[PDB]
Amino acid sequence: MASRILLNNGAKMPILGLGTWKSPPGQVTEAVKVAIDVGYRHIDCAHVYQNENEVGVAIQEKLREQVVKREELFIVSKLWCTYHEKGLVKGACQKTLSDLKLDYLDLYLIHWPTGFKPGKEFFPLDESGNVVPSDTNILDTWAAMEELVDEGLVKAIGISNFNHLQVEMILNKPGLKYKPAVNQIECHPYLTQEKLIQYCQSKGIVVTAYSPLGSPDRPWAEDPSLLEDPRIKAIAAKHNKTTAQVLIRFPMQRNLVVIPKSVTPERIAENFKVFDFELSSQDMTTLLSYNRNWRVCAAASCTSHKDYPFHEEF
Numbered sequence: 244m245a246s247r248i249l250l251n252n253g254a255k256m257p258i259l260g261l262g263t264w265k266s267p268p269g270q271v272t273e274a275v276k277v278a279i280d281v282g283y284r285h286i287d288c289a290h291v292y293q294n295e296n297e298v299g300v301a302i303q304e305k306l307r308e309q310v311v312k313r314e315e316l317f318i319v320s321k322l323w324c325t326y327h328e329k330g331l332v333k334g335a336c337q338k339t340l341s342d343l344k345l346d347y348l349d350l351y352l353i354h355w356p357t358g359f360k361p362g363k364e365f366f367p368l369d370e371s372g373n374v375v376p377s378d379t380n381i382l383d384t385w386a387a388m389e390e391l392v393d394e395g396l397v398k399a400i401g402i403s404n405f406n407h408l409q410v411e412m413i414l415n416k417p418g419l420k421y422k423p424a425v426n427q428i429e430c431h432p433y434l435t436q437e438k439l440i441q442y443c444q445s446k447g448i449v450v451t452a453y454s455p456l457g458s459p460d461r462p463w464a465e466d467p468s469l470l471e472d473p474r475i476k477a478i479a480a481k482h483n484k485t486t487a488q489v490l491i492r493f494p495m496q497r498n499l500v501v502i503p504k505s506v507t508p509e510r511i512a513e514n515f516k517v518f519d520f521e522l523s524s525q526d527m528t529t530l531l532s533y534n535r536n537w538r539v540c541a542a543a544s545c546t547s548h549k550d551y552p553f554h555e556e557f
């Protein structure tokens with residue numbers, strides 16, 4: 244299968260990228276350098292991960308050394324929740340650009356539909372354990388995202404962790420100028436997302452699957468473990484691949500983009516070797532059968548936010 248998917252802005256997005264959430268700053272520079280050396284062209288970043296400077300060191304070095312050209316890279320970042328205000332969006336994008344040592348992003352996402360009170364703290368909370376919201380609504384944040392396209396800071400804009408009515412609220416927005424190119428959502432065999440994926444794809448919005456391996460290094464982890472699931476290990480054995488490779492190929496065959504995270508050189512290389520085998524239709528349906536509606540990222544402290552995404556069915 245092809246290495247890239249056509250977005251609704253006319254650009255092509257590599258269907259396999261390197262995730263960087265939790266990648267330690269002292270390891271993520273090597274991780275991104277290795278990834279580019281072994282063929283990754285898509286890096287998934289975020290200001291809230293606090294490691295974009297070190298990601299940027301790697302990108303800049305590989306550009307300087309002519310390992311890759313900028314036009315060949317697809318760099319993604321995300322606007323954090325405390326910058327949903329109209330007057331903060333541009334500065335937030337420019338800080339990310341500065342840290343990444345780039346003059347444009349290929350894709351910039353609203354990281355969550357939930358706006359938080361602006362300030363130094365990424366998660367301002369009150370005594371109920373609930374986040375302090377901002378009164379910005381998502382349509383105004385979307386228009387500020389649209390301005391970044393028209394200023395040349397980003398080639399495409401999108402959303403992340405939006406449920407289907409929130410996607411629809413953008414798509415229905417009066418005076419909408421740019422449709423979201425992408426909705427990045429958690430997706431894996433324990434959270435298969437059939438309904439939201441079919442909705443987005445029917446609209447020409449590409450879906451990116453995050454936490455494809457079930458985020459075994461997530462801070463709040465004995466819960467389900469995709470990588471140790473004997474049923475998935477059995478499918479991997481049948482194909483003479485690793486469990487991780489099956490878990491990465493799975494979304495690819497649903498016409499999703501997928502962004503496994505690793506800081507381990509051997510795994511970074513191994514995770515990219517997924518274009519040389521095919522899961523059968525029966526394999527695909529079997530993997531889908533494992534859905535348990537289990538989320539790595541439930542945003543536990545935001546469940547009373549008016550824009551909390553995970554109340555609605557999808």
Ligand SMILES: NC(=O)c1ccc[n+]([C@@H]2O[C@H](COP(=O)([O-])OP(=O)(O)OC[C@H]3O[C@@H](n4cnc5c(N)ncnc54)[C@H](OP(=O)(O)O)[C@@H]3O)[C@@H](O)[C@H]2O)c1
Nearest residue numbers: 262263264453454455456457458460487503504505506507
């Ligand atoms: N939009 C959002 O709100 C959001 C939320 C979550 C994630 N994301 C993005 O999605 C990316 C991926 O999700 P994630 O970081 O949650 O988790 P993940 O990619 O599902 O899993 C990462 C974990 O799997 C390990 N691993 C990687 N390859 C492996 C292999 N071949 N064999 C065994 N273990 C392997 C990694 O270990 P090592 O690193 O030690 O090798 C790490 O502990 C994130 O990094 C981020 O870029 C976005």
